[PDB]
Amino acid sequence: VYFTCPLTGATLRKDQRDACIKEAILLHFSTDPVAASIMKIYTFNKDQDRVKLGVDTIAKYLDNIHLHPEEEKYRKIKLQNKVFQERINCLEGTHEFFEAIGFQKVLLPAQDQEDPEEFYVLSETTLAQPQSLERHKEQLLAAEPVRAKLDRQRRVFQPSPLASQFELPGDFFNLTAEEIKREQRLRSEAVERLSVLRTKAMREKEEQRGLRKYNYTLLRVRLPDGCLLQGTFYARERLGAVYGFVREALQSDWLPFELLASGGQKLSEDENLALNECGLVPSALLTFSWDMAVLEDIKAAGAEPDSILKPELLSAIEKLL
Amino acid sequence: PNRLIVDEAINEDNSVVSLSQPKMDELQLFRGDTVLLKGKKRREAVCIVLSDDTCSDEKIRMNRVVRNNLRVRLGDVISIQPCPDVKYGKRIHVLPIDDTVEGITGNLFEVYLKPYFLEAYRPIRKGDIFLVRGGMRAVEFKVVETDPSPYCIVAPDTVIHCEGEPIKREDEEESLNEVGYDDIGGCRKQLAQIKEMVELPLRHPALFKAIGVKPPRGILLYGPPGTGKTLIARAVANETGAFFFLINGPEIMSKLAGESESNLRKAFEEAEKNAPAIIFIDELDAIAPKREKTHGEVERRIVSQLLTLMDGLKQRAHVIVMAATNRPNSIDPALRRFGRFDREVDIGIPDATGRLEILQIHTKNMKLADDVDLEQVANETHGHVGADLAALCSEAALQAIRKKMDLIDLEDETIDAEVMNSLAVTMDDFRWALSQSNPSALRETVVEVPQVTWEDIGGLEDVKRELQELVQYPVEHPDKFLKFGMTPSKGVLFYGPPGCGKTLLAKAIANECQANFISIKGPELLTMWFGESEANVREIFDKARQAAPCVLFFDELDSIAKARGGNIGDGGGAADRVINQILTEMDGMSTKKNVFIIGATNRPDIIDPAILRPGRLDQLIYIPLPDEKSRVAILKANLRKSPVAKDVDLEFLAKMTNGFSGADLTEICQRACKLAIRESIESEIVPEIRRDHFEEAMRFARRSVSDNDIRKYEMFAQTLQ
Amino acid sequence: FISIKGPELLTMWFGESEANVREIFDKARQAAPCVLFFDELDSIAKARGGNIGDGGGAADRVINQILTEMDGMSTKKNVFIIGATNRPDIIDPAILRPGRLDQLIYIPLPDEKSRVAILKANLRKSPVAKDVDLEFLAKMTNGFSGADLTEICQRACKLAIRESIESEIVPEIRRDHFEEAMRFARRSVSDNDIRKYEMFAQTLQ
Numbered sequence A: 001v002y003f004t005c006p007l008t009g010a011t012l013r014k015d016q017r018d019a020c021i022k023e024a025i026l027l028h029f030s031t032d033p034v035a036a037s038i039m040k041i042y043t044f045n046k047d048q049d050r051v052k053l054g055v056d057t058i059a060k061y062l063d064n065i066h067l068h069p070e071e072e073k074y075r076k077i078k079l080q081n082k083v084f085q086e087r088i089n090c091l092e093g094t095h096e097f098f099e100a101i102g103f104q105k106v107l108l109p110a111q112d113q114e115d116p117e118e119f120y121v122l123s124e125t126t127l128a129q130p131q132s133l134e135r136h137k138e139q140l141l142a143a144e145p146v147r148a149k150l151d152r153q154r155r156v157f158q159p160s161p162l163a164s165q166f167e168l169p170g171d172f173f174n175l176t177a178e179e180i181k182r183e184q185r186l187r188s189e190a191v192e193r194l195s196v197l198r199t200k201a202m203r204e205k206e207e208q209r210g211l212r213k214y215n216y217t218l219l220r221v222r223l224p225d226g227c228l229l230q231g232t233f234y235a236r237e238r239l240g241a242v243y244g245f246v247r248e249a250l251q252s253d254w255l256p257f258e259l260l261a262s263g264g265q266k267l268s269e270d271e272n273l274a275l276n277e278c279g280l281v282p283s284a285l286l287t288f289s290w291d292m293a294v295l296e297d298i299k300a301a302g303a304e305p306d307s308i309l310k311p312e313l314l315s316a317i318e319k320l321l
Numbered sequence B: 001p002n003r004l005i006v007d008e009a010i011n012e013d014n015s016v017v018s019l020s021q022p023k024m025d026e027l028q029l030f031r032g033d034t035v036l037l038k039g040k041k042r043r044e045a046v047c048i049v050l051s052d053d054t055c056s057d058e059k060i061r062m063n064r065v066v067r068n069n070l071r072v073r074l075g076d077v078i079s080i081q082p083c084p085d086v087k088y089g090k091r092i093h094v095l096p097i098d099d100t101v102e103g104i105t106g107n108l109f110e111v112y113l114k115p116y117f118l119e120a121y122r123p124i125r126k127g128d129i130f131l132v133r134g135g136m137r138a139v140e141f142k143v144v145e146t147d148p149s150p151y152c153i154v155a156p157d158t159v160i161h162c163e164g165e166p167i168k169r170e171d172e173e174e175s176l177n178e179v180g181y182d183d184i185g186g187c188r189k190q191l192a193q194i195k196e197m198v199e200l201p202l203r204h205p206a207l208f209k210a211i212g213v214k215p216p217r218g219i220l221l222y223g224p225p226g227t228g229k230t231l232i233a234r235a236v237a238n239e240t241g242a243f244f245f246l247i248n249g250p251e252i253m254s255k256l257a258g259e260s261e262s263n264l265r266k267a268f269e270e271a272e273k274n275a276p277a278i279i280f281i282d283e284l285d286a287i288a289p290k291r292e293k294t295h296g297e298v299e300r301r302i303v304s305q306l307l308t309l310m311d312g313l314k315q316r317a318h319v320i321v322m323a324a325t326n327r328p329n330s331i332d333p334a335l336r337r338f339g340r341f342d343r344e345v346d347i348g349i350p351d352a353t354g355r356l357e358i359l360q361i362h363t364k365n366m367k368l369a370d371d372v373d374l375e376q377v378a379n380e381t382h383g384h385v386g387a388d389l390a391a392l393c394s395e396a397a398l399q400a401i402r403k404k405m406d407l408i409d410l411e412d413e414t415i416d417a418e419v420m421n422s423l424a425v426t427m428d429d430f431r432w433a434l435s436q437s438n439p440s441a442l443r444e445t446v447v448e449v450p451q452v453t454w455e456d457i458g459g460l461e462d463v464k465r466e467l468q469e470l471v472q473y474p475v476e477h478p479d480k481f482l483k484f485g486m487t488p489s490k491g492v493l494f495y496g497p498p499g500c501g502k503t504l505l506a507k508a509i510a511n512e513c514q515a516n517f518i519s520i521k522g523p524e525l526l527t528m529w530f531g532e533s534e535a536n537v538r539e540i541f542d543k544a545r546q547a548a549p550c551v552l553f554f555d556e557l558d559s560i561a562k563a564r565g566g567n568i569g570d571g572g573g574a575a576d577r578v579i580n581q582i583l584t585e586m587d588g589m590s591t592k593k594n595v596f597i598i599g600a601t602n603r604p605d606i607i608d609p610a611i612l613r614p615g616r617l618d619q620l621i622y623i624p625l626p627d628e629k630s631r632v633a634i635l636k637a638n639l640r641k642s643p644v645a646k647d648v649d650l651e652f653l654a655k656m657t658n659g660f661s662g663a664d665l666t667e668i669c670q671r672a673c674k675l676a677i678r679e680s681i682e683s684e685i686v687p688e689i690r691r692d693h694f695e696e697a698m699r700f701a702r703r704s705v706s707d708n709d710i711r712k713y714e715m716f717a718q719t720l721q
Numbered sequence C: 001f002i003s004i005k006g007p008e009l010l011t012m013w014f015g016e017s018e019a020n021v022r023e024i025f026d027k028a029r030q031a032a033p034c035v036l037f038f039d040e041l042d043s044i045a046k047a048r049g050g051n052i053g054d055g056g057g058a059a060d061r062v063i064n065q066i067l068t069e070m071d072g073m074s075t076k077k078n079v080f081i082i083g084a085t086n087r088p089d090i091i092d093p094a095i096l097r098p099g100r101l102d103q104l105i106y107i108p109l110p111d112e113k114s115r116v117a118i119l120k121a122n123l124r125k126s127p128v129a130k131d132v133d134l135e136f137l138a139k140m141t142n143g144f145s146g147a148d149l150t151e152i153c154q155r156a157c158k159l160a161i162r163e164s165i166e167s168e169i170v171p172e173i174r175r176d177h178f179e180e181a182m183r184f185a186r187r188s189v190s191d192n193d194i195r196k197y198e199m200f201a202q203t204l205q
């Protein structure tokens, strides 16, 4: 399977994903040090429950100085604190985040010991504008691990009427002895399942067997010109990637349109829901229609909408047989 | 290949079928793709394919409308052939079926076809029959012209035409408003039992023709009127295609001797001539009443004629006989002898879930307002049967009709579709109808799955485990019980101080198992004793078997012993007429009946000791008063549904209320609730229960179990261990 | 063998259908040779309150019909009638007169060798480990009846089942299962009742 690194555009295989993204996040520090540290915290650390605990504790330290910027006791985060040591210091990229959002790493004398302790001390440059840390806190809290983009491998097809032309033998409708035995047994088993006394745990042991089959999905889009557009997505990919996928294939990527789900339910581009939450996993057909703002001009002018996609993709149409 | 067995659907929509995902993956079609289904007589239908978590790999789930278009029935096989070449339609001409458009006029497109197809993108093929519901009418249409052919997808830009006389239905097609399986709400278990017993001999008789074993001959349905006895039998006949011959008591009993028998045997002859067929005799108790109650020629001769006609079923191949009565003991027992009516099914009374489903069936054609809550209605309609819920929906509709029709004033033979389209039934119209409706099954005992779960019982963790083990271990490890020659226990007695959860424990195990809970209380045992009607105990045990899986709970086993004096005593002892029948029936219960018998008493020293003999209530569980942590759990459970202020210290209260049982801690909670209500009402003339209300509530509640009673209960428990 | 149990005697008494006694004896006459066993002869006396009850005597509708049929039954029919009761002090003494159940046998609690035999017989349905000392157990269960020795056997079996099931979350009943059962099983006849039974047997000599 082929993937694209969302930070560099490099083509990767399934095994090269973490190696390239990790390096791209370290390179990203030249463009936005805060965004690079945020990606480093979620992407490098596989234990996401510990990542969340470290992020919440960092958010608290930033709120302390934000709410009381006039009190110097909130300017310094102690790296030897019993909470910091377990939640923040155990993660890769949290030290870089503090430096990126205006903290300096210094050694200060302890209030009761000769040995200096490690602190992240906020500088005057960022302390003068508390709204800077407030925005950086929100950027970290809303973050997630960086995952390589699945290569969509967009394809266009033309259904061939010949696929629907087939005559069956008359005997195909004669129910067999093997089918009859299963139907007769299922009738007895269905009554036995309702008649038997069983606890919920014994029911779950069998019921739960149907819950784990898929992690990817394939989508098809039915275009008004009779052409079929297909591509591949993560089972958890956002609806916005399907709209972007279609926009890339359209002859005019800016021209507004709507997509409908497999049951006719309209999906809005502004609804950032996962494909497994939209009911489009492991597979679904979506219906394409131009926005009313577009259809009104096409119809009013008497135009025939005889072109939907780029000629660069249409030249590669395969027949469905 | 690519052929699946037709089964029932959950999604009622007429343009979609559901397959098991592995078959969609082998056919390389996606959810929402349009496919053709190949049916009988060189017919096909076009639909959208989805999937669910209930369809088997070898099955296709489709509703009645799709099966009728393919001229197939449940149990048949069809082929699936994806048709991605389907194009969008430009013009489609749809006309109604005359059988459903009578008495109604106006613009059917604007009311029915337009919202039905608008943004739905349903596949349409020439000749398709589909149903659109609304305006308290179910109207079906046929497609007569499609510009693309032979099938297309409707789009918002498709021209929809509708001009011409209504279409007369073909004689080979059944109306979509006929009774089918989707018209039955509750009693799914009973319907499944009928399917097994009836569909086999009518669809596949060869399993009995070539062998010395005969098929089932007759099924007796019983229960209160209005529960679906005739509904099930009719639905089965229509779904399978068997001819339905309807017989009833009054029709035969109103006739003169000689004519009555001629009409009865003629129906049997017609059932064979038109076989496969089902002969349904309603009000069987009127055809065959107890002989000692009548001496008429018609009542006695009709029984002999029916008895021999039932025996004639050996030759009347593909014919089965069903009957309906009120109770299994209300008919001449001759009909229940070997052969004849060999099987029986107890329909019972729909529970809260079934009542909701029944209401949803009746409202299929009704426009409901956003405030209508049918689940709330189903919970209020205790004691009602489907016949009463049908009347309830009708009365609610009639109230809404009167309110608007007084302003519409349409004086003609037909009613406009538009004015019906805007007619909605509100929650006030259902509430009004509820106040006018009167349940027909309020006298009979209602048996259903209880809503009490384990989280509703504080403490007693070891008891919760034992009750679960008594159900899981005898069935997961039968080889180990056989290996050591042990028979699993089929009952338990609960004893100890009152108000500790005896009843809740029996309900909670039934809840988790989704088993029916049958509650027998003191007054019921006393009624049988006082009225010398102990024979009714046999009916209680028989209901437990029919209700299986169920828990048969005999509360207040000492109610009669106390009525006879308890501590003093009349002229009898511990045994009485009612417990003697219970003891006799208990000996007949098997672990294979999926019935668990639970008893409870607050005075186990005065109950017939025979009930504890091996083979009966062999398990004995002592329920002590709750400890400190359990009392807190009880308070939290009692307040689980109420707003409680953060200043309320439930652990503090539990530390003081040392002698208080769960029932007594509930009194404190409810007192604090009542105090909070008074405070709120007086303030209007606070929104949560404050500590002050709990502190006052604790000043009025008292422990119900004294120190003397605690020692009495503990000594008994130690005596038996 | 014809078995009449308490519930049948109580049904006839409570329902005023003591005439059904004739059908019971008629079965014995037609089933001959047979043994006509009337269990729980005191079932009605106990249902009448046993020790307190009403102010009347031991006679009732059902025992009167039984005694009548007994007198009308000849030994020439090869029918032998056996009765049993655990409370002979509350049954109609008429049944003990010559011509009725005039032979009396006292059945005490099993002795040391009998209790061992009972334990061995009751365990014939289950695998038992070689370490189980049934003679030691019988020596301890001095006040136990045969039914109470069954309770021990059943408890030890159920304990073996419990442990066996838990091991999958054992192949036989081990000494530990019987010793543990000894802490849950109890004698059904108290020391006061044992002396009452012996003193009653002594009173009858």
Ligand SMILES: Nc1ncnc2c1ncn2[C@@H]1O[C@H](COP(=O)(O)OP(=O)(O)O)[C@@H](O)[C@H]1O
Pocket: B183, B184, B185, B186, B187, B225, B226, B227, B228, B229, B230, B231, B350, B358, B361, B385, B386, B387, B388, B390
């Ligand atoms: N279990 C049920 N499920 C659905 N509808 C029911 C049920 N029981 C009764 N009904 C409804 O109540 C009415 C019953 O009247 P009827 O057809 O005479 O049958 P019966 O009197 O045998 O119950 C029908 O309108 C039917 O739809």
Ligand SMILES: Nc1ncnc2c1ncn2[C@@H]1O[C@H](COP(=O)(O)OP(=O)(O)O)[C@@H](O)[C@H]1O
Pocket: B456, B457, B458, B459, B460, B498, B499, B500, B501, B502, B503, B504, B505, B633, B634, B637, B638, B661, B662, B663, B664, B666
């Ligand atoms: N263990 C318990 N946990 C929670 N609530 C209890 C408990 N025991 C009793 N109650 C309260 O007492 C009330 C009566 O309980 P119930 O089981 O009907 O008592 P009984 O079985 O003695 O009649 C219930 O509504 C419940 O709120």
